[model samples]
Target chain A: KSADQLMSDIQLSLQALFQKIQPEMLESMEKQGVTPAQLFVLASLKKHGSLKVSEIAERMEVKPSAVTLMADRLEQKNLIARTHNTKDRRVIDLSLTDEGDIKFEEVLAGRKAIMARYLSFLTEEEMLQAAHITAKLAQAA
Target chain B: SADQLMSDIQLSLQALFQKIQPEMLESMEKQGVTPAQLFVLASLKKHGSLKVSEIAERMEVKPSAVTLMADRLEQKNLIARTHNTKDRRVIDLSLTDEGDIKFEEVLAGRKAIMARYLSFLTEEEMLQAAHITAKLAQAAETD
Candidate 1:
């Protein structure tokens, strides 16, 4: 089938997924007083560790300028640090602060709980298949 | 599997998936305007035949909001309304030259090669994922 045909299914899946989880996502955002974008940044850091601002921007699929803006705000909040690269002065690197780490852990925990509930529908074989396909879909897109 | 482990992995995956689309859209904005909203635009352009209520249903959004977006797109000269002959109360929307230009521009650059991520998976894995997603989505609909 054409990709467009596939998208309806994907969109439906997405709609359903969002309906189930958006409230929790919002709750996390509210408690942290952070936008979803900032929470994404924290999640990125937790996933990939310290990264250059530009790199983080790439992984997040956002503009470097946007990343800079987010990093600046995050720094002001004392949740992350933005330091100049020693090797390349123009390059800025991002590191999670202790507070960032703690908050990120909480985000992780909250997400885990949600996932555990949803994934209960699948078997181990199915889980592996789903993960592999999901990872593939991300790549394919 | 242990509940805690399942939770940990599931959450990590969820976080990654949840942020991916928005991130992709944000990344595109640096090069030019982001047309995440244009998904609506394209649909209107294609059918050349929809009322506000019908458009909303197709877009899977609320009718009032769709009307607002239509107004904005109209203001941008991206789309315009042609009065419906069959139903005077309804208006049909189609893209203006400017809107079509913008839509094509967005579509051309929209294909980012994240497919490499899926290349690691076997065909069976991909099928499995698609099935699970379809099933999960159906279940959610029932709920």
Candidate 2:
């Protein structure tokens, strides 16, 4: 196959793989009362600690305006807070509130249950291989 | 060595890796789309045929905004509409002439970049990389 054809083939496989994973993500998003984008933001925070609005947008790969909007919504839900940088009022730091932290914890904890369900089908050896493979791929990619 | 220790090690490594994942928002802002959204379009145009709902389904996204993306692609002349003969409600989707040309170009550029990055990997390591990616792809369920 040509390079284009190979890329197309990979795309096809990715779609198939994504289909298998979609419903579970949707279910979790609904349960958490967060959009996928919002969930990503929360996860980014959980993974990276507190960040500025600009930095959060950078990590989320969203526009600053988009991040502002998301931050506004998250703030309304009491999941995150915007604090003025005492030294630099121009800088606004975004951090998860207590409730936000709880929500993040809930989402993270909930993953084990869902991961267990899908992983249950795989043998212990398969799970280890899966983890190793994923770690390697993430590193390589 | 034990399961608990292994799990802890994995979690820490995962956290570190996730931290390192590229943030392309600045670049993406110029394109007026997120990488996630761009990838969805790339996936659709790469596939010769897909339905509107099917495209959304494949991306693990909601169909509501997919309507808007279809509109954008249509406006951009990157995709054209077709009807499913079996079901009127279903749309048999395929890229336009322009879509094919553009997708091929984009895929080529991406492949070149990826190839360059992986040049150092041995054949065995390459297969291992694919193996790990395929497995992770299997595990990243939204639910």
Candidate 3:
């Protein structure tokens, strides 16, 4: 009886907690002139230095067309350059431009600071412990 | 994925580690189609026209079980059902535009949620999680 009663009450609290924390977290992080959806693309472009629409699409488990759509936005922002590789005749590859790299790092810095503050509770080691346990659990899963 | 990336997204936030498990479990629980249902559509797509029993074997269920599952799928309008001219009691299964789409929804749905979850982590950790999970296969219980 206690287990049943406890879990339901716990559910409501976590729902409220998640609702309270999420948007403010997104609003600040996403304020970097990119929407939340677009951030994934930017992250990948920065990580690889260059990738094709099909390349990231495979990893993202999304369609090439869907990846193409996000590529269009980042292209317009001049954050990533799309060039047909000399080797591939018609392959379009993506890489961050100088400006895009700078922009991403700035957002990266801000996010790190933001994460620090949001996670300022009970501090860092407990936080690292949280991640260690999580990674292990998922490994088994 | 409700796997690593989500763990990364919500990771190290606090004791919310303990708090976050239930939400993740529920997300894994209730969603669009199950892996078995999606595979029925895939095998139908792969083989073109499959007998209900054959779909059952590919799906590892009984023939009557496929029939039972097919009833719900036909109602969802994702798959088409036909009566065999050779034997009226025999049924043939084929994929529809809608059926082809059901697969994409699971792909798209998981990615959308993942991209949301990915936003909470550092770009580097987000990058790392993708490769780690790549070796893991899609979380769908389908083949």
Candidate 4:
């Protein structure tokens, strides 16, 4: 195929791959009663431990108010809690409750399973190449 | 690396894609269209006129969902539905000239955005990525 055709094919393939994974992601999130945005916050907290709302907003590239709303909903579900920062009274720290930690682990495991299933089509060599290329692409971005 | 490491890499790859999603959504919003609509239009443009079921299959959406999207696109004059001459019960869908223009505009925007994000990949790397993606897509199709 020509370069142009290859480019178009690549774009189409990526889009199709994304479309295929979406329903699985949505279904898993639905089962957990969490949206992708909420999962992001929980996952971030799991990785980074306690974080302020603003820090989560930064990681999510969303507004602080949006993160605040997520925190409120997650808090309502007993997934997370807020405590006053000792060093700075003005700062509020957010941490996952035990329930939140469990949920976070479940979501990550589910995501990993789904992705692993998708990548299972490739051989070990292909998987390595994919990982290498993906890391390079992410770094470039 | 072990399978566990591979899983980590897969998760990181997903995160990278997720990071680019907001910009993609914003680009579509600026065009006054949703990603679903754009997908339908692009499918029609590539495959020529097709039945609603065919379009739905290509989009991996339910026929009813495709009908809803068709309704909205028809209202926007981006696509037209006509009864098939050979099979009166079947409805054929095709993009209008305006639909073609809109699809092209959206395609251009997508290309520009993707190019910026993918600028770091060498030509060979891009080819490899494309090959792997195509293989994955083909595998999914078979499944």
Candidate maximizing DockQ: 4
Q: List the candidate 2 regions with Cα displacement exceeding 4 Å.
A: A1-30, A34-102, A116-122, A130-141, B1-47, B50-64, B82-91, B109-121, B129-143
Q: Model 4: per-residue lDDT, tens digit, A52-93? A: 999999989999999999999999999999999989978889
Winner by TM-score: 4
lDDT-superior candidate, 3 or 4: 4
Clashing pairs in 2: A24-B142, A24-B143, A25-B142, A25-B143, A133-B132
* lDDT of candidate 3 over A29-87, digit per residue (tens): 66778765566777788888788889888878789999898889989999888999878
Model 2 chain B: lowest-lDDT 10 consecutive positions: B16-25
What TM-score would every model get versus the actual structure? 0.52, 0.54, 0.47, 0.82
Worst 10 residues of 2 chain A by lDDT: A2-11
Docking class of 2: incorrect
lDDT tens digits, residue span B1-143, model 4: 56766666876677787777887899889988898898789789988989999988876778999999999999999999999888999889999999999998887787777767566777887788788999999998787
Q: What DockQ do the predictions score, one after another?
A: 0.22, 0.17, 0.02, 0.52
Would you list the rank order by TM-score, best first?
Answer: 4, 2, 1, 3
Can you list the residue pairs that collide in candidate 4? Answer: none
lDDT of model 2 at position A94: 82
Q: How does each model score on lDDT?
A: 0.68, 0.64, 0.61, 0.85
Sort by lDDT, best first: what order? 4, 1, 2, 3
Show where candidate 4 strays beyond 4 Å.
Answer: A52-55, A58-64, A82-93, B53-65, B84-91, B116-120
lDDT of 1 by residue, A4-99 (tens): 334444444654565566666677667876777898898788777788978888888899999889988889999898887989988888988899
Residue A125's C-alpha lDDT in candidate 4? Answer: 77
